[PDB]
Each structure stands twice: as structure tokens, then as C-alpha cells.
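Structural prep section.
Before we set up the soaks we want a predicted structure of the protein with DXC in place, mainly to decide which crystallisation condition to try first. Input record follows.
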Amino acid sequence: CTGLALETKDGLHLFGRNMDIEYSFNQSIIFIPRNFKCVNKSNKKELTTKYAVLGMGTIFDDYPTFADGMNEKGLGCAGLNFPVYVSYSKEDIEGKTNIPVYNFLLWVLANFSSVEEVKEALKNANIVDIPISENIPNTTLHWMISDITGKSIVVEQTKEKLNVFDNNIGVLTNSPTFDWHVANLNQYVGLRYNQVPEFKLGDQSLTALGQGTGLVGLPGDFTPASRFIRVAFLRDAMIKNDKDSIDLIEFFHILNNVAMVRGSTRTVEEKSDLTQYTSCMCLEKGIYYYNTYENNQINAIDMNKENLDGNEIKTYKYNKTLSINHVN
Amino acid sequence: CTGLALETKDGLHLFGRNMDIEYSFNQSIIFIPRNFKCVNKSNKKELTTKYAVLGMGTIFDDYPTFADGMNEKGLGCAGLNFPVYVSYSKEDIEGKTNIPVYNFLLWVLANFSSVEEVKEALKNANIVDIPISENIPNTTLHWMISDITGKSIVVEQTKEKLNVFDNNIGVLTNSPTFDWHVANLNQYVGLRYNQVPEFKLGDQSLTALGQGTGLVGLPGDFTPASRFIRVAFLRDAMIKNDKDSIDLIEFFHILNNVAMVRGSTRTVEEKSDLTQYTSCMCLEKGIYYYNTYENNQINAIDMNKENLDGNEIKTYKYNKTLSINHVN
Amino acid sequence: CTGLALETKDGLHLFGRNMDIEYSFNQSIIFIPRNFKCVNKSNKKELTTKYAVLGMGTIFDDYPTFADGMNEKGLGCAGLNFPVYVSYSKEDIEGKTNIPVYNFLLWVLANFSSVEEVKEALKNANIVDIPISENIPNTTLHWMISDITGKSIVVEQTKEKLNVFDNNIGVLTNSPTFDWHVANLNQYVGLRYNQVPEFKLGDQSLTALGQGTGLVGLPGDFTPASRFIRVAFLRDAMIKNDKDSIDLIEFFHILNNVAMVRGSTRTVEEKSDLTQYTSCMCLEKGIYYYNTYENNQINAIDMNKENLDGNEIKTYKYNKTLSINHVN
Amino acid sequence: CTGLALETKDGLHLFGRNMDIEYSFNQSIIFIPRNFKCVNKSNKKELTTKYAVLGMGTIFDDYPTFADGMNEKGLGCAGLNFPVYVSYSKEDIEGKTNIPVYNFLLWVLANFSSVEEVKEALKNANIVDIPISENIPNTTLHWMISDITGKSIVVEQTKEKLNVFDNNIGVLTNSPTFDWHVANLNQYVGLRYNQVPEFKLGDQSLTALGQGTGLVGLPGDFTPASRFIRVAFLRDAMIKNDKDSIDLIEFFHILNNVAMVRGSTRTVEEKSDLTQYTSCMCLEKGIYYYNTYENNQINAIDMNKENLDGNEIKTYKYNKTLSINHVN
Ligand SMILES: C[C@H](CCC(=O)O)[C@H]1CC[C@H]2[C@@H]3CC[C@@H]4C[C@H](O)CC[C@]4(C)[C@H]3C[C@H](O)[C@]12C
Ligand SMILES: C[C@H](CCC(=O)O)[C@H]1CC[C@H]2[C@@H]3CC[C@@H]4C[C@H](O)CC[C@]4(C)[C@H]3C[C@H](O)[C@]12C
Ligand SMILES: C[C@H](CCC(=O)O)[C@H]1CC[C@H]2[C@@H]3CC[C@@H]4C[C@H](O)CC[C@]4(C)[C@H]3C[C@H](O)[C@]12C
Ligand SMILES: C[C@H](CCC(=O)O)[C@H]1CC[C@H]2[C@@H]3CC[C@@H]4C[C@H](O)CC[C@]4(C)[C@H]3C[C@H](O)[C@]12C
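Run finished without errors. Recording the C-alpha cells verbatim:
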């Protein structure tokens, strides 16, 4: 997975992600109105939304759980795989705000209006490995949270504590921990976006054979660390050189570079890991944009067109049918 | 630029390219019917089409010139940048079939029905640096040619001779020469598509932190050599592991990985080099599919819907307006 | 700098380092006998040796300070540059065992007989930035400690605490922190020491063009992170495949691979960073072996030949005069 | 193997090589005086030396054959492995100067005084796969030739022709062909010897964590292509920044960086490929310097101390016994 936050030329804030998995999670785009009571049937735990929510998720055992989404106030959150270095408590910890893994994303979006509000609430928080149903293990996760102020944070629970990092990179991938990736960026201080046309090697003249010689050394594989480096620098380059050109499609161009392609990222179970979908939320406007591996046309769902004072969950069908514009 | 040939699950043959440039060439999708006489006004040279042609190009000084295209017989050709190691003759060479640089692509498509036919015609061919108009230098180019048999060739004129390579890789980028890239592939024999989950480093257990550990070492920059390596192995992996899944969208997924992103590939003139468009021709069906940097929705133009016995050139407008599916 | 611990075919334990600096520190090989009182004239602080010590260092303002060394009991310690992430206290911390930066190495060797003894003593230790003389800033350092049991530890003081890591890698370089490097090793689980002779790329046969195709992707620069990776895997490979062949010269072969070469590692002050010397201590035998950038012949100083019950510091001259064996 | 030519601060010319093999070839340092008739017993072919010769080789079936050496006139030649792209004729070609593979090095040194003389003689030359004895296949080889003018050439016979390249890089390794490696250098125009201390990544400050950030992207494995890149740039950096410091030991520092280490370069036959020896010839002085994997002390054999008008081949024993300077 790759998370990305990007400000447009008009001052709007985009936040979204690549979803990198080898399976379907029966996903749909889920809208939840204000004052809606979500009840988990297995453990009787309840959540009533303060703010309306829109995002990608699934309804499991009659309970909504999210992969990424936003609320009506322009707060966004995405859950990304975090298989190594993660540690959840087995049960509730006395004196803490205990949040089940499956419910963390919804807990953020339903309750808070800003990154600053979330940061305060997380000071005494603990993420607990309570199954959504039966005894099913929760997915190993860490979260990126971003809002209309342009501020982003990263939430990672380890065996030590619940870490909340300020994210000045604007990106997130997977393991290792966020501080590891930030330190890893320092190894690439020698990268250059500007073409290096020549090098005088003593008696031999060296000439650039094509565009892009400044970035030689950039890692090209699909590991979380390599993807983190690529997205961090691609984002930086666009902001530095083309701030006044940043719009919706640019978000997708950045994430396309770190997208997994069928056949080349094979799991030990011999399945192809794919970028199943790419989502981009315009936080101010409350519009959820996305495309899929099967259908690259961007689809838009505007939460503000729905009744925020409604009484039911509304779902929209995940679009995996290629949409072609037939010109003639 | 990156050229790609790919066979689908149904046995159809896709051929196309990323167009990587920092400028617009006033491009449109151009259809030329059978028996159409193309006259160059500056040098009075003429070409009358035997076969109908469809592809991306421009009409310069009243004369059509192509970036990539196909004919009605399922022969495809793409012209890609070749700034180093290229050498054209200044004038016609006696006893040779002399083809002006700007006219090579059209010469291939208008006259021949197969790769085998082209190969025979190229034995005594020479590419000459005749300006399309005025004294304007021709773009430095090499060509990939592919047909419905699945065979591909690469055409490169150097100071030595006009080279015609059998292309068993299914890909092409830019400089250096094709044989250089083929030899460069040998450096990556150690790549693996299958996950490497662990490594026992004596007393230290090493564990994969995410998917993709087998491809560590793959180059991630945007130079022609690095892009060649990436597209070659991404293509190979898909054919090996997912032959029965290959369809139209897979072509775009492969090329997306080597697409240039605004801001990060800066020329010495301080302009952003971009993948302006991505084309994919279904050679059997005569359908030209493409999307653009601005609009990622795939557009389709079917040459077989047009009158192949028509009397005029027909053009279709280059689509750079983002097409979004508004769901609600 | 690069630290290395290696067990020989006979069961002896070698420990030593590359010294990577752009300057001379007026170094000599220093022997200190038992019961010798070292007095710092500037701050009146005193240290009386329990065990005899031998290693590379300098006598500054009449006080001995070490770069690397061992004691008579087979305990070894090396101080390596640690410019980022280091944090010393400005003054003594109440209730802690406060050790000045310049004196840490000698404090370890003079007082303790084993890694286990040191580990216990470090639990309540604190490293303080007390100048050796005047107001001169101490070098930013972290330490590797190793003994005749084959156990190694890494000592790093950060803004959080004094960290003592178990070192199961057998190596150390410079910044970032030790846990960062250990996690970085996981990115290279795909490395192979065994030749990969071929790769079938569909219709194209790829053949290894020379030996070493399994390690493609290994970083080749001279940064601390890249050097850590190289030494870790070179060491692992030798132990796995040639345990029964490991002797003195093998230690030097490993470190030669990460040695800096004049001209190519230039500081911002435009000086060449060099591997000034390479030391290798046979811990059981008490022999300090070393060579230098100028003279590659290995020199040996045996501490057990000296009087351990002596009354004076004894120094031996740093050998930087090339020693050639003239055969004819 | 890695060949290197380097000019010293005093204007002397050093030429030599790493010998990278997994076996012993019963090597000794061989001196052949002037006017000495070498007779091959198996094929009755004869060679009488014009100039006296000194270098590493072996006496096989009573016939001397060389790995690397020089003559009394300051001409040097080294034979390096060339397993791919090599092509020898099966028999003598009519009208050509036919030279058996095993005899090429000696043919160069025994007959010619300069690179220019050799270049002229090679115009009509052909290298033939005649066995030294029995039906034993000759080693696949290419050659580097260098003299006291500082000029170097590379000799490679392919299926096309006998190629003689001007070598302006000052280095050679193994396969692919020399022109391939020269073109490969162009991919690294973005390398920098000078430290890059920082990078402003928008809201995140990136800081160099150690020396060497300018060379990130340099390949670190032991393949011929990677070694070629490393030696080319290490040599260039030393000449650019430290021309007035270049002496004998610097030659060894450069080659040490590309030396193979026991255990990590394993052949398909499960043997460790090693840098068995490193030779450095001072061409003006006629001194052959070398060390070995087992003994790193440099040994010197001066051909000018021998009788150049002698009547016998003289050999000196290959030194593989570690020479240590015991100080106390
Ligand atoms: C799809 C996202 C994000 C995962 C990722 O980005 O790696 C994850 C986050 C939480 C995940 C759910 C947690 C509870 C369940 C765990 C089961 O073992 C699989 C189904 C469920 C219902 C999961 C489905 C899906 O796998 C979710 C919604
Ligand atoms: C766009 C393709 C492919 C270029 C590439 O892939 O790099 C190229 C191939 C031939 C090119 C034309 C050749 C003749 C002209 C040369 C002028 O200096 C620029 C305009 C023209 C009319 C060119 C426009 C455009 O640049 C074309 C059509
Ligand atoms: C040489 C080693 C190791 C340094 C390294 O490996 O980077 C270091 C460790 C402690 C260092 C000494 C600390 C105190 C002094 C600090 C001064 O600013 C330079 C001279 C002194 C006397 C230093 C000399 C030298 O620089 C030493 C002995
Ligand atoms: C050692 C050098 C250089 C090889 C290299 O650098 O790879 C080579 C060059 C020519 C080689 C000789 C050629 C003829 C023989 C071929 C046999 O199959 C092995 C023994 C002999 C006598 C070889 C021994 C040795 O292998 C030599 C002397």
C-alpha cells in the first residue's frame, strides 16, 4: 500500500492510497450519515457517528469496517498493511481509550473534525486485537490521517507504545516503522531531478544517453521501503517544480509509479499481489475519487450530494468493468 | 519512450507505446484510406498508400507524419527517440531504397502487410536526413515493427549500416543500441518474481518486511536503460504467471510503471518530460486505443468502421480533457 | 569506520576495525600495564587500570585516549564515528555511573574482563560530554565491544537513553542507530552467494556474463549504511561456506571491500576520507595486528611479551612506510 | 579479473591486474632473456624472443605461457577472462598473422617495443584456438596492452573480427565487449565524489548521515560490469583530486575495492572465486610488484637486475606465505 497527501494548485487537499492486496475484501464505497448507530453483533460494542462518513470498506457480519475514507469535516484516514513491528494488546488496558483494530478508522472519522483533535485523543489511546467476529485475527495495520489544514500524522502501535508521528513527507507505505523510512530518506540526498548531461572522465567524455540521469540509484522494486523512497521524491519534485500545475490526475500519476503489476509480485502462496484500486479524496469537497485494476476510469462519489441527516447506510458498487470512450 | 508488444489471453496481438516528450507536436489520430496520394510540397516527393493506415501523428506543411500506427493488415510501427548512436545519410545513396526520416513510419505501414515483408524490403534500405520542410532537422529515431504473427523487429541506422534486429524481448526504449540493451538484460539473471520470505544470516534471522523482496536491485529511475529492464521483466512475469489473464488493461499497467511523472524528469531547458500519451493497438481488430497525461480514460478509434476505400484523410481530436464517471 | 568480529578455524576470536578519517590523530600503539594511574590534568579525573591494555590511541595533554584496543583478559573495544542520533549529557547525572566520552574505551578495557561484566556495568551508566582539555568538543562516537566468548555488543547513547544492543551481525559502521541497520538487512533477503548461470526470459535466453550474478543489487558506495550491508553479507558468506578456512588474512580481505580510497570520498572541506589503518586483534593471544594506508604489510605487537606488572606507559610507532620484500 | 593503468606523481607508468580465479595454475614469476627460443613440443611451433620478458605465468608441457607481464622496453600486457562474445578460428586463416590463444601475450611482449608497434601488427592478425598440448581448450581471453607513453589498448576477437580499441578509461574487466562497458559508463554521469551534505525535501530536512552520499547508486557486486564501473570512477577520482599523491600503494587500494573475497562469489561447482593475486608493473623500471590472497606483503622482482643476455629461463616462487612484521 502507498498513502499520499497532495495540495492542488487551487489550495485544495487530496488524500488517498494504493490498495495493494492479492484478494478481494468484498469492498464497496460506504456512506454513513450522522447519528447512525453501528452495532457489532459478536461483542455488542457500539459506535454512533457524530460526523457523516464516506470511504472504501466492507460490511462484515452486519458491521461496517473501512480501508480508507473521510468525514464531512475534511478529515481523512487510511489503513495500510503493517505486518512487521506491529503489536496490539490482547485485551482492554485499564485507564486507556481502547479501540479494536477493525474499528480504528471509523472511530477516527466518526468522532473528530481535525488532525489536532485526533492527536489529543490518541495520547491515552490503545489499539486492541478484538476480533470483528468469531476468533478471526485482525489485519496488521498502521494508519495515515490527514485534513484540510494540510497536516498529516502516522499512527503505529508497537510493543513499546502507541506512536503518533508528524508526517512532513506526505507519504506512507508499509513496514518498517515510520521513523525508519524517514531516516532511510537521508541515504538519497544525492538524487537530482535536473538532467546531468555530461561527465568528464579524464580522457573519456561521458554523455547522457537519455533523460533521467540525475535519479540513477532510485530503487525500482515493489518493497515498502523502495516504494516509500519513490513516492517521497516524486511528490517533492512535483511540488518544487510544478506547484501551480497540481490537480486530480497528478495524484494518480504519482501513485501509478509504485503500483503493483500482475505477475511480478508473487506471494509465497503463488498469487499475484496487485494495486487493486487507487483512491483520491478531495477533503474540502467531500468527493471520493477512485479507479481499479480492471477499470482505470476515475469514478466520483460526492458525500455532500447524499443526505447527511439520513437514517440508513448507503453503498455504491465497486467498479471493475473497463469503461472505454468509443470515438467512432 | 517505451514500446511494448503483448499477446492477449484470446490470442490477439497488442502493440503500442508510451510517448515521452516535454512538448506537444500538434498531434491527432490520423486515418488514411487506400490509394491516397501524399505529396510533400517542399521536396515534391510522393507516397500513395496501398493499405489504409491509422495512428497518432501530425500534418506538417500539409504532409502527414506519424509517431506510431498500424495498417489494415495488422502491421504496426512505432518511432521512438534515438539521440545517441544514430546516423542518417545527408543525401540519397545510389543503389539503395532511400527513405526520408520523417516518412519511414508511413512508408512501412502504407506498403507492407507483414514483418517478413518489411524485413526483405529493409535489406537494401537507407534512411536519409531529408527535411520535411525548410532545413528543419529530423527527430533522431529508431523504430519497432510488429504484426499479427507475434513477431517483432527493431530498426536502427548507425554510422556502420541499417540494422534490423529480431526482437525476442517484446520491448524497446531509447539509446543505446538494441544489442546493448539485450546484453544488459544478462546482468539481471538473479531477479525473482517469487517472494523471498527469509534469509538466515548466521545468528541473525532476516525476515521479509513486505512483498517484493525477489526483485530488489531492479533500477527505478527513468533513463532508457532502466526503463528497458523494468518493462522487459514486468512483461516476462505476466506471460509466465498470468498468460490466461492478459487483456487490454494489462498493457497499460505495464507501461504505467515506466511512465514519466511531472516534475521529476527535468530537461536542461528546465521543462518536465512527461508520458504525454499511451497507445495500444489491437492489430487483428484495427482498433487504436489510447489515453493521455491529462485524461486517463482509454479512447478507442476503430479503423474498420471508416471507409478504407475513402478519398480523404480523416483526423480525430487528441483527448486531453479528464473524463470522470460521476456515480451520484 | 567498520568494525568486525570473526572466529578463526582454530576457534580464536578476531576483533578490529577500519579507521576512516581524513586526518591524523597523532596515533601510536599504546600499552598500559596493570595498576597504572592515568590522571587528566585539566579536570583532575583519575583512572587506575585493573587490567593491562593494548591498542591504537594518542596521548593528549599527557592523557591516553583510545580509538580501539583490548585488555589482557581478551576483552576488545572499538570507538567508531556516530555523528547523527548521538546525544551526550552536558554534565554528570546524579545517581549514574558517569563516563566522559574520551575515556569510555579505556574505562571498558581497564576495568572489566568480559562482555557480560560490561553489560551489567552499563545498566546504570551515562556518557558525559566532558572535554579532555580546554573546551574541545568530544568526537561523536558509538562503541563495539567483543570478547573471547564470541559475544559482541553495541553501545549507543541517544537523547532517550544509553542503549546496549546484542550484536548478532558481527559488524558495525556509523550512523544511523544499530537497530536501523539491523532492520535494513531485511531488504537484502534476496541476495545469493551462489552463481545464477541463466534466466529464461520467454523467447530470450539470458546467460550470466561473469561470476557474481547472485549479489546484483548489493550497494557499492562508501556510506555507513552501504558498508554495513556489504560487511554483514561478506562475513556471513565466509562463515557459511569457508568456516574451516578463516584465518588472519581473511579478516583483512573482508574489511578491504569497505575501505575508502583516496580521491573518491571527498568531504565538504575538500579532503580525501581514507581508511587510514586496519586493525585486527587476536583476543586470546593478546596480539594487536594492523596495517596502514601507506604500508599494507601487517605489523604485530604482542602485549603478553611486555611486562604486565610494569610501571610505565609504552608506545610503539605508527608504521606508515611501505615495506616491500625485494626478491632479487 | 580487473586490469588497471595508472600514472604516478613522478610520471612513471604502472600497469597490472587482479587475477580472479577459483584455482591454481601452477604459477610462478617467469623471466625470459633476449634471443631465447621457446619450442612447443606438441605442435612444433617456435618463438624466439627479441626483448627480455618478465611476468606471471606457468610452464606447461615445457612451454611458457603468461597471465600478465612486461618487456624490457616498457610494454605491458595482461590476459583477462572473456567467456562470452569471444570467438577464435579453429585453424589458421590464409593471409593472416595467426597467433595461438595461449601464445598471444608472449607474442606481444617478445616482439614489440610499444603500443603503436602492436597496433600496426594487429591489423592483419588472427587469434587461433590451437591447443598448447593434446586437445585441451584454450582459456577464453581478451587482452589489455599498455606502455610508457601512457597509451592503452584492448584486444578482443569476436565472430566478426579482431577488434583493437583505444582505451581512454584505463581499465578492463571481463564480458561483455569493451564498447559495451564504455557505453555503460554513460549511465553513471550523475555520480559525485564530493559530499552532498543536505537535501531540502519540502517540509522535511534531509541530512547526510555519513561520508559518501555523492556516490550512492554505485554497484557493489562482483560481476565484471559492476567492477568495471567501480574501478573506472575510483581511478578517475584519484587522478582528478590527488594526481600529485599517486604512488605504488594507491594502485593496490583501487584494485582492493574490486577484489573477490572467500565465500561470497561461489561458482556453480561450489568453489570460492578469489582475487588470487594483484600485480603492478612499473613499466619504466621493469619491476614486477605483486601480492597474493594468502600474503598481502608486496614482493618485487626487478628484471633489470637479471642478465637480459642470459641463456636460460629463470623462475621465482609464487609467495603465498603471510609475511608479518613482528614489532616486539
Ligand atoms: C482492506 C483493509 C486494509 C488492508 C490493507 O491495506 O492491507 C482491511 C483493514 C481491516 C480489514 C478487516 C478487519 C476484520 C476482518 C479480518 C479478516 O481477516 C478479513 C476480513 C475483515 C473484515 C477485514 C477486511 C479487510 O482486509 C480490512 C477492511
Ligand atoms: C512525435 C514523433 C516521435 C518522437 C519521439 O518519440 O521522440 C516524431 C517523429 C518524427 C517527428 C516529426 C519529424 C519532422 C518535423 C521535425 C521538427 O523538428 C518537429 C516537427 C516534425 C513534424 C516532427 C514532429 C514529431 O516530433 C515527430 C512526428
Ligand atoms: C580516533 C578516535 C576514533 C574516531 C573515529 O573513529 O571516528 C577518536 C575517539 C576519541 C578521540 C579523541 C577525543 C578527545 C579529543 C577531541 C578533539 O576534537 C581531537 C583530539 C582528541 C584527543 C580525539 C582524537 C581522536 O579523534 C579520538 C581518539
Ligand atoms: C591464468 C591465465 C589467465 C586466465 C584468466 O585471467 O582468466 C591463463 C591464460 C592462458 C592460460 C593457459 C592456456 C593453456 C592451458 C589451458 C588449460 O585449460 C589450463 C592450463 C593452461 C596452461 C592455461 C593456464 C592459465 O589458465 C592461463 C595461463
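Observations: Residues 224-242 of chain A form the longest helix (19 residues).
Flagged for discussion at group meeting.
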